[PDB]
Amino acid sequence: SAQQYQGIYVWRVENFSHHLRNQEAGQPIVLHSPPFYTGRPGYKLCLRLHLQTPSAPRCSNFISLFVHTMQGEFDSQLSWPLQGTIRLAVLDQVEGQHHIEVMETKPDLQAFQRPTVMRNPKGFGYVTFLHLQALRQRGFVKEDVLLVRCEVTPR
């Protein structure tokens, strides 16, 4: 039902410059978000964000962003696998020119099953979600905060 997808999560990544300075020094960055529910009842999800190093083959200096399913309170009353459309965004806090990727679920992927551990090791998303030079040029980071949004809509 529609109420199972009514949630929208905005991940506030504070002190972004700290991660950036470490990334510039050649440190991979990986961040794990708080959990959120697509609805009540609904699916429990979390996000994983990477800053790839300046020398990573094929994806140097990118933000990578992946969605992971989790074991949630409502799981017994949900259909599985999770099916729908997932919208991932980095938000423009002033001009509304968000960077948005839209992706449909795939029912045959482990990432959309209910995991047998608390957090699914398999996630789904973009290795090359947003390049750090594009993030800088657009000025998405305001007061050292990056906003990452995740919305799920039904089929």
Binding site: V30, R48, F66, H68, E101, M103, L109, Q110, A111, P121, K122, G123, F124, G125, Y126, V127, T128
Partner: peptide, 8 residues
């Protein structure tokens, strides 16, 4: 892209 990746 998008793709499934593994993060233990």
């Amino acid at each position: 892209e998008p793709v499934e990746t593994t993060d233990y």
